[PDB]
Amino acid sequence: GDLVIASSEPTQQFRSLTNRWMPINSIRVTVNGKRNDLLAQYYIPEDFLSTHAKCAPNTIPFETYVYGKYELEMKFVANGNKFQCGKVIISVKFDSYQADNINTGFQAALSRPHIMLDLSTNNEGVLKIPFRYHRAFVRNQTHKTATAGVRPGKFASIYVQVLSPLQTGEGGANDMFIRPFYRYTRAEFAGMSYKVPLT
């Protein structure tokens, strides 16, 4: 509805570049973790631009375009031995700008759409993350000539937290890892312009 009106020009999709999976840097899950402590948190799509996956082919169209809508999926993979046990919850929070301090609890994680990873069975989790922002579009990149009134590259936050701490047996592995993946299911881009380095 808001797509066609707000953009005079039609938006473009890059299914070959976007729909493919893409890993990021791993998550260490220790036995030293307590409840409601962050393993990880991400401000999408900025933390898929600047920090993690800089030279990914998924990040090719984000140079040139200055607006877009973003529906993602995020598959997480847990790998621990059968002599451990622990619970990790991952939720999403739409338009989380100036709202990261509050509703950040595991309770809010349960309330918001989430996935529940067991660390013994070694299950996977799929977060269908649609676009819910308080404008028609989100601004893609910051720029030194751009205005400082609008904070770009943040329409949602990911929150990876201990739901229940990891326990191990006698002489067991003291930690196990989780690898996050992501991909774009609906990526529409408006406002073509000259390319820039990503942050």
């Binding site: 409601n36 002599f83 046990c85 595991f106 309770q107 349960l110 013994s120 819910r132 326990q167």
Partner: protein, 273 residues
């Protein structure tokens, strides 16, 4: 021609219309050009997963409490023991944490009824095994030493194995059709004032406490393999039943204390550096 108007009626003047009533009719004056013009929701509207009622908020799973269970814990020992009140967590001390949505929204209504579901998830592997029981006691509590008294009440036995979860429905049997909330309907004390029996004497209501109790006991002790952990942890989730009910809007029991700052006029009040 200029004929007279013979028609008349007796009228009772009132200041406002539908001021107490949440629905019905309104005396609203639109600050628009067209008085029948309303805000459009043709393009941007509500999302279908979102709740329409406060009961649908009370149908969300929230972590009530957790508790540990070890191989040293003998049979008959009360692992879990509480008063299942959707009103309050405690009758005797301060609370400060992340309350369940059903207890949060129940804190708004004066009256509640219907069954309350518990889902016990067990943080374990497939090599932990041991039997526990779920007891629901009405009109009386049992002695902690005497398991046999608790066995007589409304119970559900679970055998720990491959499935590391169990659903449970706490029923609703009392003398009344609806139970009222234990916490007060109006508390004007805000700044943590030192309270005496004189201040307690002029309370807006009386805390009609409940002696209903939920207990979980050991039937057969957790006998794990040496290769895995001996002491596991249990998640106790909780939500309202599908026939849960609420009534009588009142002041909120709970209120946010985490990262609260009062507003000020932007930007006269020292915002410009």
């Amino acid at each position: 021609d200029k004929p007279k108007d013979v028609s008349s009626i007796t009228i009772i003047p009132k200041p406002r219309l539908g001021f107490p009533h949440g629905k019905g009719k309104s005396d609203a004056v639109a600050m628009r050009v067209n008085p029948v013009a309303l805000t459009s929701f043709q393009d941007v509207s509500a999302y279908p997963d979102e709740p329409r009622t406060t009961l649908d908020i009370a149908r969300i799973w929230g972590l009530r409490s957790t508790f540990n269970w070890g191989s040293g814990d003998e049979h008959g020992k009360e692992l879990f023991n509480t008063v299942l009140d959707p009103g309050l967590r405690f009758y005797d001390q301060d609370y400060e944490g992340q309350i369940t949505p059903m207890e949060y929204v129940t804190g708004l209504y004066n009256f509640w009824s219907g069954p309350i579901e518990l889902r016990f998830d067990f943080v374990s592997n497939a090599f932990h095994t041991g039997t526990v029981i779920i007891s629901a006691e009405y009109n009386r509590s049992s002695t902690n030493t005497d398991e046999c008294q608790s066995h007589s009440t409304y119970t559900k036995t679970f055998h720990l194995g491959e499935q590391k979860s169990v659903h449970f429905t706490v029923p609703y049997i009392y003398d009344t059709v609806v139970r009222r909330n234990t916490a007060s309907a109006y508390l004007p004390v805000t700044d943590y004032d030192k309270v005496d029996n004189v201040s307690r004497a002029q309370a807006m209501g009386i805390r009609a406490e409940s002696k209903m109790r939920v207990k979980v006991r050991v039937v057969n002790v957790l006998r794990p393999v040496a290769s895995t952990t001996s002491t596991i942890e249990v998640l106790v989730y909780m939500r309202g039943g599908k026939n849960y009910a609420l009534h009588g809007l009142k002041q909120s029991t709970y209120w946010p204390s985490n990262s609260v700052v009062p507003i000020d006029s932007f930007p006269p009040d020292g915002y410009d550096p």
